[PDB]
Amino acid sequence: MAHSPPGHHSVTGRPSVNGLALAEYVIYRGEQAYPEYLITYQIMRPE
């Protein structure tokens, strides 16, 4: 596991080329995330 940038606690990936895309985030300490909800689902075929 790598380290966070000096003086930071995570990394935010900002979508640039893609307009509709939302952010992605990276942490380097497993303790900075708690799994709250477990979702069971299926992807649905478009009409």
19 phi-psi bin (left φ>0, alpha ψ -120 to 50, beta other): alpha
Residues in region 18-37 near other proteins by CB under 8 A:
18, 20-37
Structure tokens at 14: 């900002």
Tell me the backbone φ, ψ of residue 31, rounded to 5 degrees: -75, -10
How near is the Cβ of 6 to other proteins at its closest, in Å?
A: 9
Kindly list the residues in this chain that would bind other proteins in the complex (CB under 8 A).
1-2, 4-5, 7-18, 20-46
